[PDB]
Design a protein around this ligand. Structure first.
Ligand SMILES: Nc1nc2c(ncn2[C@@H]2O[C@H](COP(=O)(O)OP(=O)(O)O)[C@@H](O)[C@H]2O)c(=O)[nH]1
Ligand SMILES: Nc1nc2c(ncn2[C@@H]2O[C@H](COP(=O)(O)OP(=O)(O)O)[C@@H](O)[C@H]2O)c(=O)[nH]1
Ligand SMILES: [Mg+2]
Lengths: 348, 101
């Protein structure tokens, strides 16, 4: 478990914040939010929790993500979690967090596969995290089931648009490997909000459920459908694994063996896996934080220039200074005589 | 393929399933959530009452270990008037292996 690529980026945020906080101003470290987009049963929830590094989300077959979950990571001296609707309560075990998520979902949506556009806000504190916003959205569908109205498609789409048309947001498009990539819904959305692929990152899931004799080699090599940032293959847990409480360590080891042994993927074994997706995202934050430094320097540079002309004199102040008093006297008298002539004569 | 490939293919479907004296076979794999099928959405829009539509489930040997399609084959998840029929075809390895029908 855990995400150790944050450690190299936490102090940079602290140092810059301490730099501005001393002057009574805050640092515009507007780190982007990460939205996970995909279709029903694509694997989005499994992907997202691997970036957080904690096992707390609900996952499995069926419509499990019935409400948008917004996770806010906050740097803190101790690790704990809390909800907005459980004010005054403290969560010290993520299993309780997962159960609360299901309970809060059913209380509003019912049990017959309902949805609700009102999100759930989870705030996890920890010393090993940045101040990040992570969004876990419901998957998209075509036809209603259970109590879903005829317009279930568009209600889900609007929930999606509110979080992906927002600037400064990484779109993490997850698609299954055992379905034709031309018929993925994630990529249809990405190419409508991010035409040039500057934000979009593709993930290919379910590489271990391919039909025998077929592979995704022309996908992971960015040949079938060119994507600016390429595709990353991942092998998450199976539904049996979820119900079997399979450990994370075993899942990662199996993912490593898979890519190292599959004949069509060995030459890409180092571009794929859970840890590589962490590295790409972390590197994506680091590029953003370092791309904003020029603005911060210019702000401080402008302020010094404005203040410098006066503090040059204040720093040399001595109360016993006849020269200052007489210089002040000549300035006041010259100001009065100019103001006086202005009002009477019209000069100036 | 131009940007409007989606609506060019759809306009071809709407020339054969938008008329009477026609049966429609809604084909969809079983290794994906049935709620996301494009076959049913088209059939439901053209044949709301399910008079003509018949559902087919094509890939039952490719389902993730630990689940099954009973909720569909028993016409419970998305009840369809004429039910659903499950089939198991030749894999890609078999097509290239010259396996007899
Ligand atoms: N074996 C395997 N199972 C997967 C993979 N990706 C997703 N699944 C399964 O697909 C189901 C759906 O997972 P989930 O992410 O909750 O779908 P979601 O509704 O999009 O969140 C789960 O049972 C996962 O175990 C994969 O790469 N390999
Ligand atoms: N293993 C397996 N493969 C299947 C099954 N049904 C279809 N396929 C595969 O589906 C692939 C494409 O089928 P096809 O009918 O051409 O899809 P189409 O583009 O709609 O015609 C073929 O390679 C088949 O081997 C199945 O039940 N099991
Ligand atoms: Mg989900």
């Amino acid at each position: 478990m855990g995400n150790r690529g944050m450690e190299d980026l936490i102090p940079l945020v602290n140092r810059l914040q301490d730099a501005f906080s001393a002057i009574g101003q805050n640092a515009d470290l507007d780190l982007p939010q990460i939205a996970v987009v995909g279709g029903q049963s694509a694997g989005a929830s499994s992907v997202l929790e691997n970036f957080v590094g904690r096992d707390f989300l609900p996952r499995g077959s069926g419509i499990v993500t019935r409400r948008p979950l917004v996770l806010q990571l906050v740097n803190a001296t101790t690790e704990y979690a809390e909800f907005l609707h459980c004010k005054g309560k403290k969560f010290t075990d993520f299993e309780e967090v997962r159960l609360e998520i299901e309970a809060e979902t059913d209380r509003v949506t019912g049990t017959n596969k309902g949805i609700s556009p009102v999100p759930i806000n989870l705030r996890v504190y920890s010393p090993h995290v940045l101040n990040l916003t992570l969004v876990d959205l419901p998957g998209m569908t075509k036809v209603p089931v259970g109590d879903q109205p005829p317009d279930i498609e568009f209600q889900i789409r609007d929930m999606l648009m509110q979080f992906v048309t927002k600037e400064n947001c990484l779109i993490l498009a997850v698609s299954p490997a055992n379905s034709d990539l031309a018929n993925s819904d994630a990529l249809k959305v990405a190419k409508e909000v991010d035409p040039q692929g500057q934000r979009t990152i593709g993930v290919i899931t379910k590489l271990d459920l391919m039909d025998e004799g077929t592979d995704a080699r022309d996908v992971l090599e960015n040949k079938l459908l060119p994507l600016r940032r390429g595709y990353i293959g991942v092998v998450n847990r199976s539904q049996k694994d979820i119900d079997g409480k399979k450990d994370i360590t075993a899942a990662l080891a199996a993912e490593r063996k898979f890519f190292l042994s599959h004949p069509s993927y060995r030459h890409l074994a180092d571009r794929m896996g859970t840890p590589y997706l962490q590295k790409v995202l972390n590197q994506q934050l680091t590029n953003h934080i370092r791309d904003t430094l020029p603005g911060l320097r210019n702000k401080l540079q402008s302020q010094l220039l404005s203040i410098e002309k006066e503090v040059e004199e204040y720093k040399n102040f001595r109360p016993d200074d006849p020269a200052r008093k007489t210089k002040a006297l000549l300035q006041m008298v010259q100001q009065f005589a100019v103001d006086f002539e202005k009002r009477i004569e019209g000069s100036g």
